[PDB]
Ligand SMILES: N#Cc1ccc(O)cc1
């Protein structure tokens with residue numbers, strides 16, 4: 001859809017953007033969001049690096065599921081064809097004071113606007129998909145582009161990586177510095193005569209060790225609706241996520257810490273430390289955010305069944321998966 | 325006092341510290357604080373850069389006035405001889421949940437511990453007093469020290485800078501890049517013979533223009549207990565200050581935006597944008613944090629009369645200074 | 649000074665279960681287990697469900713010795729999380745065409761041999777639909793299997809998850 | 812593209828007041844004002860209070876022409892925020908020994924001249940206790956004075972603050 005964008009700003013070098021009643025602009029340090037509420041224009045600042053990492057995830061994930069929060073004021077709720085953009089709406093205090101605003105959007109329009117924002121606000125010196133130790137600053141005046149980091153083209157996984165008609169392995173990528181000790185050996189495949197290329201196996205740890213992005217579940221095996229979506233996590237999950245289905249985490253290397261709270265209240269429910277080999281169900285009625293000091297291998301196990309929202313709303317699926 | 329420190333960690337290179345029931349440690353990305361509440365150990369991660377900047381202020385200001393909040397969990401409260409260290413106690417939700425804890429310390433013991441933490445946790449690469457654009461990373465493993473930055477010292481103002489035996493001027497300091505356009509002209513002092521050095525005047529703007537730290541109110545004129553404490557602000561005030569008395573801000577250059585919240589809740593109350601020449605009272609019952617895109621010049625006006633807090637605590641004085 | 653990189657992997661011989669710290673509610677809700685503890689306390693090749701989502705399963709297998717021949721009507725996948733497994737593949741003459749979940753293929757499956765794969769830790773292979781496959785393990789290891797709840801899947805949540 | 816640095820200062824001829832957005836509460840309690848707007852709407856050297864803290868005050872004065880002679884029992888301070896102001900000093904033979912706040916020193920103050928100081932924008936001078944002093948401005952200017960509430964201090968909060 002048609003993006004509403006201004007001329008580059010005379011001082012900062014950046015364009016402001018309009019999306020329905022929202023105004024998005026950035027300066028040398030902050031993204032700034034404005035919106036109407038009770039007759040006045042309301043504003044909110046978010047540090048530009050925090051903002052960009054968050055929007056980068058929202059764009060790469062296609063708005064994910066449930067509530068993707070940039071911070072405790074700004075967020076989106078994917079409605080699977082339409083996406084709500086909200087400010088303070090899911091914030092007890094702002095909501096009670098009636099200074100919040102929400103507006104609904106056809107996915108392609110908000111997506112186009114968002115891609116355009118990343119393009120414009122991401123300088124050549126900053127990669128929104130990387131951990132801080134891996135990249136430069138998002139701060140300062142407009143200064144080049146980083147298309148290569150924000151437009152990562154990916155062949156979708158049909159079955160498994162490495163298959164001929166499928167998503168490629170990563171032998172042409174450097175091992176990340178925090179996985180430099182991980183074996184790079186491939187499994188041995190021994191095809192019986194007349195069966196060359198009928199058997200398939202690759203090194204998942206090697207494949208992960210060569211991941212060039214953080215907090216990005218990517219499909220590595222497909223069993224009907226069941227998807228294995230491993231990802232390498234460093235620093236902090238760039239958003240806090242409000243769930244709308246049960247999620248499963250299997251921690252494969254190192255450790256991650258999850259703050260788990262009330263989707264609406266924000267009230268603490270649990271603090272989960274996941275170590276190598278741990279398996280955890282994240283319930284459909286919480287929100288959470290992860291912390292991973294060392295780049296670690298996390299398996300996110302997804303379920304791509306279309307009527308999930310119906311199942312949870314109906315009561316066919318409880319907020320937590322297992323009674324025992 | 326006698327700090328309780330561990331040996332350096334075999335991997336991170338950092339020491340950990342014990343202050344009463346509080347344990348304070350850091351790794352490559354996060355400072356970690358644990359404490360007892362509701363029959364168990366509770367924990368909280370804060371990015372090492374954010375933590376160090378806040379700790380730096382609390383130590384330079386000798387714990388300041390009232391509440392100094394590192395973030396929405398950890399903070400200290402000055403009793404002017406004794407200091408509380410807390411986790412969650414001034415967060416309405418955490419307190420409601422009963423996971424908060426407060427412990428009381430003699431000022432010398434906590435100050436010695438905080439100074440040791442600052443010294444142990446600040447790498448040669450990181451200036452906890454500067455803006456993010458003025459310094460490097462606080463992340464990674466132990467790597468040198470930055471005594472020159474964490475152990476700044478300048479003479480306390482007695483009456484006014486530039487006077488005999490008083491606090492110095494800054495003619496020996498470079499003009500900060502973001503004040504490069506500020507006049508360096510002094511005022512003309514024409515003394516009448518027999519009266520040399522009896523008249524005193526300097527360029528406050530020149531003075532601030534050469535300030536080598538951010539968010540650090542510093543006395544430039546003393547009128548009984550009335551103190552003028554200007555400072556140069558960039559990025560975000562590294563803490564949320566909770567008032568124990570009334571203060572006033574006078575914006576002298578550019579702009580700063582203040583989030584104003586409840587002192588005891590942390591709950592939003594107002595958003596104040598202060599432009600050049602603006603004058604604002606910050607009531608004794610709020611907390612606040614500022615945002616300044618360009619390094620700006622701010623006058624912070626304090627009343628240093630002793631025992632003021634009791635008058636506010638008791639209700640004898642209203643939280644706001646003036647009825648009209 | 650220390651510049652070493654240590655990617656911590658666990659094993660049957662050496663693992664440390666994480667922790668669920670409850671502030672409010674019940675640890676039950678998080679179905680929290682650890683695949684190494686699980687394999688450590690299970691029979692060889694018992695397919696222990698450690699994740700269940702609308703009938704899709706993640707199973708943990710203790711690889712020790714030689715498994716039964718397995719088969720399914722749809723694709724499955726195996727990740728070797730510890731040890732070293734050899735996987736033998738037969739292309740069945742008469743593959744299961746309908747149904748879900750791994751099934752016993754029988755003592756002597758009828759079909760051409762396709763070959764085998766040698767999986768070490770961190771390695772993944774496809775278990776193609778309409779094939780029979782068998783696991784070989786000289787030393788105790790751990791296999792993660794992605795599949796669908798079937799006749800062989802064992803549920804024992806109260807035994808394996810925090811409560 | 813742009814690498815210029817423009818430190819924004821305001822003046823009588825050019826000023827833009829900020830804003831108080833309320834979520835819960837009253838703008839009133841912030842006593843929010845702008846010194847340049849206050850000087851623009853005030854008599855010459857009318858000591859307008861823009862800050863009050865339990866007896867201590869910050870006064871805004873519109874510098875235009877010559878002020879009366881002022882004096883006080885305790886130190887005071889002036890900062891020039893707009894224009895040029897020349898401050899004359901007089902070491903009185905009989906300084907005020909008691910009381911607070913700036914008082915009128917009279918038409919013909921008795922004492923030895925001490926000299927003068929020239930204050931442009933951003934300059935600050937000491938107004939030493941027991942001296943008398945006065946301001947001279949060819950061009951309209953603005954002075955901030957740090958002192959104590961006295962007989963000259965003018966309060967007009969409902970006029971200068973956001974309601
Ligand atoms: N929820 C959620 C989530 C998203 C990305 C990721 O890498 C891990 C967890």
Ligand SMILES: N#Cc1ccc(O)cc1
Pocket residue numbers: 538539540541555557561565571624
């Ligand atoms: N209150 C308060 C405060 C503390 C430091 C600073 O730079 C500005 C305001």
